[PDB]
């Protein structure tokens, strides 16, 4: 059986931390709120969920979370409207994804709606920490880790679920959208079919640090993850990739790679697909995109916009790709970027409550 939100214990902080305040820079994931959610799992099942003061974790040196990466995480945002109302963006999908990640690592199952209610209560306690300035939000970070005090590679008989919160600034401060340049080198592979790249597991990220540093040395901001001998475009850093172009059959379309096992099923990715399909102005498809297809479309002037999608960036433009020592210029910014700006505006209006929408979950 799962832990219940009705069994939630609340321990308030005796020493509250000084809040950043409007005007001061909010660097991504470095500032933390006053409280955290904590739920323990053992042989007898789940314990009662607790909202306790922000504090360090006490782990046994042999904890399987530190030796065999029995760890997963989620990432979603809570937004504060001008009237101080806080709302979460499609959290049910993050709960769905978190459970799939738990099953892949043989970690304990939980009830998705009970966890969501526990998270709603946590954000409610720390509601004053959610910033209200343009483009700002509260990043919610749920984590489930194996906590077995054994060096055997096996299913944990002990686990720990915790949630921490971070007030974060605008990804594009000032409102102006800025593009990223990408390094596309086939020597670096993020995931493989039959692997775990389609799950938000800690293991998929650590190996990317060295690759990102190589991208920075070569003058690029992020990595374009290529897959297969045909160099299929999969991800842009930790974002899903979208290409807005006129296809080889002459039809205007928005394309993104299909969920074949090497793509992480993003919540923003699904939201852009749902939004574009509702408009019905162009074809919306999930199909494999190769470097040779992109190269042919660029020389024929068929590419309008290329972008990445994700919780941190929302919609991020791509203007340059460094491939085979040659610089490929993508006319994303010269085209507005019309579609990116339209997606950003509509997401902003839904997120900050300007538009009523079923996608938003009130806190």
Give binding residues for substrate as ranges. Answer: 139
Pairing of strands 50-53, 35-42: antiparallel
Residue 342 Cβ vs its own copies, minimum distance, rounded to whole Å: 29
| Smallest distance from ligand PLP to CB 95, Å | 12
* Total residues interacting with ligand PLP, rule: CB under 6 A: 14
Distances (CA, A) of 358 to 32, 75, 151, 348: 29, 20, 46, 15
**What residues numbered 224-263 form the site for ligand PLP, per CB under 6 A?**
235, 238-240
Phi, psi of 7 (to 5 degrees): -95, 10
**Range 339-343, long-range pairs (CB < 8 A, 24+ positions):** 339/244, 339/254, 339/304, 339/305, 340/177, 340/305, 340/307, 340/315, 341/177, 343/272, 343/275, 343/314, 343/315
Q: Which listed option, ligand PLP, its own copies, none, makes contact with residue 356 (CB within 5 to 8 Å by class)?
A: none
Task: Indicate the residue among 81 and 202 with the shorter CB distance to its own copies.
Answer: 202
Map residue 163 onto helix, strand or coil: strand
- State yes or no: residue 260 binds its own copies (CB under 8 A): no
> Based on CB atoms, which residue is closest to ligand PLP, 51 or 360?
360
We find the least distance from the C-beta atom of residue 221 to ligand PLP, in angstroms, to be 16
145: contact with its own copies by CB under 8 A: yes
CB of 260 to its own copies, least distance (A): 13
Query: Cβ 275 to its own copies, closest distance in Å?
Result: 27
- When asked if residue 72 is in the footprint of ligand PLP (CB under 6 A), the reply is no
Q: Which long-range contacts (CB under 8 A, 24 or more apart) does 149-152 make?
A: 149/60, 149/62, 149/63, 150/62, 150/64, 151/62, 151/67
Applying CB under 6 A, does 266 fall inside the site for ligand PLP?
yes
Q: Does 246 bind its own copies (CB under 8 A)?
A: no
State the Cα–Cα distance between residues 201 and 236, nearest whole angstrom.
17
Binding track, positions 42-81, relative to its own copies; x by CB under 8 A: ------------xxxxxxxxxxxxxxxxxx-x--------
Instruction: Using alpha carbons, select from 130, 212, 111, 217 the residue that is nearest to residue 168.
Output: 130
> Does residue 202 touch ligand PLP according to CB under 6 A?
no
Q: Which of residues 181-200 bind ligand PLP (CB under 6 A)?
A: 200
Ranked by CB distance to ligand PLP, the top (closest) residue is 266
Mark residues 8-37: x for contact with its own copies by CB under 8 A, - for none.
Answer: -------------------xxxx-x---x-
> How many Å is the Cα radius of gyration of the chain?
21
Residue whose structure tokens are 């003061």:
53
Tell me the C-alpha distance between 196 and 61, whole Å: 26
- Of 168 and 360, nearer to its own copies (C-beta) is 168
Q: Give the Å distances, CA to CA, from 294 to 211, 251, 255, 264.
A: 23, 15, 12, 21
Instruction: With CB under 8 A as the rule, give the number of residues binding its own copies.
Output: 66
Between 8 and 243, CB nearer to ligand PLP: 243
Does 234 contact its own copies by CB under 8 A?
A: no
Distance in angstroms between the alpha carbons of the first and the last residue of the chain = 26
Q: Which residues bind ligand PLP (CB under 6 A)?
A: 75, 200, 235, 238-240, 264, 266-269, 309-311
Q: Which residues bind its own copies (CB under 8 A)?
A: 27-30, 32, 36, 54-71, 73, 103-106, 139, 141, 143, 145-146, 149-155, 162, 164, 166, 186-189, 192-196, 201-210, 212-213, 238
């Amino acid at each position: 059986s799962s832990f219940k939100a009705a069994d939630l214990q609340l321990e308030m902080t005796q020493k509250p931390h000084k809040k950043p305040g409007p005007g001061e820079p909010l660097v991504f994931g470095k500032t933390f709120t006053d409280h955290m959610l904590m739920v323990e799992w053992n042989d007898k099942g789940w314990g009662q969920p607790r909202i306790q003061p922000f504090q360090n974790l006490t782990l046994h040196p042999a904890s399987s979370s530190l030796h065999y990466s029995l760890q997963l995480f989620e990432g979603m945002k809570a937004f504060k409207g001008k009237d101080q109302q806080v709302r979460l963006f499609r959290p049910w999908l993050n709960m769905d994804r978190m459970l799939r990640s738990a099953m892949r690592l043989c970690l304990p199952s939980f009830d998705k709606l009970e966890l969501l209610e526990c998270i709603r209560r946590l954000i409610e306690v720390d509601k004053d920490w959610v910033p209200d300035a343009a483009g700002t939000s509260l990043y919610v970070r749920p984590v489930l880790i194996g906590n077995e005090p054994s060096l055997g590679v096996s299913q944990p008989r002990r686990a720990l679920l915790f949630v921490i919160l971070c007030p974060v600034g605008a990804y594009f401060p000032g409102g102006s959208v800025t593009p990223v340049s990408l390094l596309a080198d086939p020597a670096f592979i993020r995931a493989w079919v039959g692997g775990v790249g389609n799950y938000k597991l800690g293991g998929n990220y650590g190996p990317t640090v060295l690759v990102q540093q190589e991208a920075l040395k070569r003058g690029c901001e992020q990595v374009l993850w290529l897959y297969g001998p045909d160099h299929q475009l999969t991800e842009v850093g930790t974002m899903n990739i979208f290409v807005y172009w006129t296809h080889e059959d002459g039809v205007l379309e928005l394309v993104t790679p299909p969920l074949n096992g090497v793509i992480l099923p993003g919540v923003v990715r699904q939201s852009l697909l749902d939004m574009a399909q509702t408009w019905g102005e162009f074809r919306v498809v999930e199909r494999t995109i190769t470097m040779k297809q992109l190269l042919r479309a660029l020389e024929e002037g068929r590419v309008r916009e290329v972008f990445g999608s994700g919780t941190a960036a929302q919609v991020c433009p791509v203007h340059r790709i460094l491939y085979k020592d040659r610089n490929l210029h993508i006319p994303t910014m010269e085209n507005g970027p019309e579609l990116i700006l339209r997606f950003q505006k509509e997401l902003k209006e839904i997120q900050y409550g300007i538009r009523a929408h079923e996608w938003m979950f009130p806190v």
